[PDB]
Symmetry: C2
Subunit: 291 residues, 2 copies
């Protein structure tokens, strides 16, 4: 395929995605707030447009890899007159509702809009491990599918432009919270003079087992949550809530951040106050859904 | 080995541990606040002691599998006169300083004390996947190591009775916080009518890759944290903090718990306020260590 592409935003992700698209035989025209940053991808065959307008006018497909959606408006507002007849593919983090309004902004300027959420770090872009969530108009996705697939295995979720964003934010909810918990635990262990080089392999070793620890003895958390079925015979909210209390207590004594473990503690407390101490830990979702 | 064992506390863990010890040829005498709960392990060859005193006097080794350390005091207070010359192995969650004081309480009553933290759910007890952290007097550990290994591969951390507890609390810090994040994300996706049966495999599928997504592009977090090395070339705190902001925003709009994502958000905010927006995410540990 030789569809000409425009890519705006040359952080690590933009640079890797440009390279992937070049390697697959696409002309790529790039633009960046900091043009010096384009030197690498220019050496690989990208063309540096001088202006956002020139960049947009060089592609059927305009991909954004920016910190947030405000950046999309910042860069494209001077170029709105050149959007008509093109597809904007925004591969940036923001809220679902910002995303939906941006889709409408695109339409108003005569363009189509696809939402994407890239689910791997830069070095994995364009590899068999890469995958990207997409939502928006099916015909628009299908038109550009072969081009986009170069970045990573596409997972089209449906018509709502906000849905791929919601999925990205949910994934990153788990990812960033997990990472914070690793740093929290590493700090906790640090207060007895355990180094991060010692603690992090222990912690990561445990994290590796989590899918299997969740499956043990025939538990199947998702379908169980859907059924309002939370049997506590292998672990109760009382018992795991006690541990959340112990983590808070240990954290208080350690002089470290209390907000993360207290949020977890609060999940258990709500379930107990609502009379479900005997239930499995999945019951915490009720109080999370309705605070 | 046929060392006689006493095990107090017959939740799922106590029952599984009793079974494992029986299968390895140990006499096990059990006691429980709710004796009816012992029926299963009695059918498998355990002897139900009538009283805590009788239970303690039947074993060289007294294992506790109780919700917290207060329970240990509740059950053993009437039996304190029978502790002398025995080893108490507490496999219960509590704070490190509660644990240390408990060790001294044991010594005062003429017993030795070992701290243990069991790192797998009940169905994995006694399997090749099982492991348990231990701390306390090395000679006491070495004496009972043969018996204890039946429950799971022992990981002795040193002399401080509080250290295996600190490690358990740190592990459960990661585990419970991760679980809370899964339910948080599942709730978030629920607000667009995505079922938990759909969302949880996606989220778990991402979590599966975390031990490897952190290694992409040659990152080695632990040693790097020890070296105060936080290069931001593949991901910055500014960019990941923006995503934390987006999760909070999405969560606010979704009507779900804000405390968990705001805790994570605050980790990023502190790093930026302290002038490290350009750094890798690991830098959040500084603000966690010193709130
Ligand atoms: N890094 C990852 O591992 C990863 C993984 C998947 C998804 N993502 C997402 O991918 C996107 C790109 O992230 P990244 O890590 O590659 O880079 P980043 O640090 O977010 O920077 C991306 C680009 O945004 C530009 N930018 C930011 N604010 C701007 C504004 N107001 N006006 C114009 N340009 C602006 C930067 O300009 P300058 O070059 O001039 O600074 C840069 O070119 C983000 O939305 C991120 O959440 C990242
Ligand atoms: N479940 C897991 O997957 C898991 C994995 C690793 C570690 N752990 C840890 O292992 C320990 C046991 O957990 P579990 O899930 O098997 O059981 P649990 O729900 O914590 O109950 C364990 C035992 O504690 C007893 N108990 C609680 N408070 C008591 C008190 N004040 N006086 C006397 N007995 C008291 C219960 O008595 P009754 O039988 O009369 O109610 C029961 O026998 C906990 O510390 C937990 O954190 C659990
Ligand atoms: C979806 O993957 C990411 C999103 C935001 C930041 C990061 C990633 C993956 C790799 C990493 O550690 C940094
Ligand atoms: C150390 O493993 C646990 C501690 C407390 C609760 C649970 C576990 C692991 C298995 C599970 O789903 C529930």
């Amino acid at each position: 395929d030789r569809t000409p592409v425009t890519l705006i935003g040359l952080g690590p992700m933009g640079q890797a995605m440009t390279r992937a698209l070049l390697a697959a035989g696409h002309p790529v025209t790039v633009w960046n707030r900091t043009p010096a940053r384009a030197a690498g991808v220019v050496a690989d065959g990208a063309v540096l447009a001088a202006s956002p307008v020139e960049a947009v006018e060089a592609g059927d497909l305009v991909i954004l890899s920016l910190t947030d959606y405000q950046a999309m408006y910042d860069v494209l507002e001077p170029a709105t007159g050149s959007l008509a007849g093109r597809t904007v593919v925004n591969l940036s983090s923001d809220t679902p509702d910002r995303t939906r309004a941006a889709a409408d902004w695109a339409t108003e300027h005569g363009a189509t809009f696809l939402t994407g959420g890239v689910m791997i770090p830069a070095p994995m872009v364009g590899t068999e491990e890469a995958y990207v969530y997409y939502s928006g108009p099916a015909e628009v996705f299908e038109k550009h599918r072969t081009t986009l697939t170069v970045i990573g295995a596409p997972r089209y979720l449906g018509e709502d432009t906000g849905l791929a964003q919601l999925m990205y934010q949910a994934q990153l909810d788990v990812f960033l919270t997990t990472l914070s918990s690793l740093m929290h635990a590493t700090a906790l262990l640090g207060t007895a003079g355990v180094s991060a080089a010692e603690s992090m392999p222990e912690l990561i070793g445990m994290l590796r087992t989590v899918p299997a620890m969740l499956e043990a003895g025939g538990e199947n958390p998702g379908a169980d949550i859907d059924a309002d079925k939370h049997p506590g015979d292998l672990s109760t909210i009382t018992m795991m809530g006690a541990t959340a209390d112990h983590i808070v207590g240990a954290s208080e004594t350690a002089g470290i951040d209390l907000a993360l473990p207290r949020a977890v503690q609060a999940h258990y407390r709500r379930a107990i106050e609502n009379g479900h101490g005997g239930d499995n830990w999945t019951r915490i979702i009720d109080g999370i859904r309705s605070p």
